[PDB]
Amino acid sequence: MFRSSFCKNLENATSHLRLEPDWPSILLICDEINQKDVTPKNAFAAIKKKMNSPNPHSSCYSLLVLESIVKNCGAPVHEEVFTKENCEMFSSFLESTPHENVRQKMLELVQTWAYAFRSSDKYQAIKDTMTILKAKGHTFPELREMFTADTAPNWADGRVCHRCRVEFTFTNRKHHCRNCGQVFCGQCTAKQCPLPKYGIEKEVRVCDGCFAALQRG
Template sequence: MFATSAFTRLIEKSTSHLNLEPDWDSTLQICDSIRQRDIQAKFAIQSLKKKISQDNPHVSVFALGVLESCVKNCGSVIHEEIATKEFMEFLKDQAKIRPDPVRAKILELVQVWSHAFRNEPNYKVVQDTFHLMKMEGYTFPTLKEADAMFKAESAPDWADGECCHRCRVTFSTFLRKHHCRHCGNVFCNKCSSKTSIIPKFGIEKEVRVCESCYEDINGPSNSKKEDDGLPSEYLNSPLSKQPQNPPAKTEQEIKEEEDLQLAIALSKNHVKSKHTNKTNTSNSTVYSQPTVSNS
């Protein structure tokens, strides 16, 4: 009961008509609740259907955005709930009667899902709905291939463990475990201290990721920039790509350098000896007393 109440509050918060932009914190918590099986996928979809069908178009669009994130991040438990005749008929009916912003979002989702599930016989109803709506004269937006790749790039199931996946330290009451949202493994705070957006999972808010995944997402050069503190102009220039270590010296160059060092040492020794001899000569000079005449 407590989990259901908390989930309902998250749905209300993420779809509020007062929101000026998507509430990613609430949306990610909704996805987490479904993935962790705290909430049944069927209940989640029913809750979102109520919001999608509300008269306020802002609420409907935000609810469709939450649904989109759930489909991208929660895997087959959600896919099985949306890829049904009942749910696809619901979306089709909503597209007929709702204003442009809501209709446009529904058409976008139906097209993306149709492409993503094109090789899934169990989800054929999604593709059938897409083709039927095209025949009925609906104009679908241009398909972005990246948006339809979430099936192949779906967020991994969260692993569990008693120690950090990277440094192997054991978790305790005072050393909490954290999940990397990119790979799904568990890490200590030190090994998962970075944050990043994850576009391929539809996560546009910076979330916790492990060190390795941070470099996979952003490239090793980004983390190196932070550590080195070097100007971006230099890091983006061809000079930064060149090897920074001096080239290895040849045998001839090493011999010439040794000869030069020896010559410098001999020269210094000669000057020092000359100075010492001059000092000794100066100290040994005898001055005679002047002769006083008695006359």
């Protein structure tokens, strides 16, 4: 039964009822692994079962959970995850799933991971799985990028607005964008939005460049 806190958070995070990711539960999962409440092995096995959920949304969401722990939980997770069998499993998985949305997300992760651990000795079964998949006829998504954990960038300072370069005065003062951490004038940071991946659910101040980029990805 719900028993471990981890399992309740995974149920929550992979629930077909959510219309957008449940970042709060996903961030809780990352902390539980990082703090040793649950082992990388047990987490990954529970994740696999959710990957095999008959629901397309639950199945794809579990892939998002997977992307997050690989990104936020370090070597303990990387070693559990990127093995020969698992990379091959990832392969058969994406090749036989009835949901294309699921297959596309897995293809993207394989490639993201191939480039992320490109300079790492320990991992490469990933780079090859892509070789075989790119050789087997599978087409990969557009590349976007190692990766940095889900954490708000540090906040820079400066004497001019990063975007428009206007010089700050005592009246036209600086403001930080919560997504990139740079300083901007108020007119270049007049919009706001949530940054749930950084644990921020409320709408906070962001710069124009970030508001545009967030609107895309």
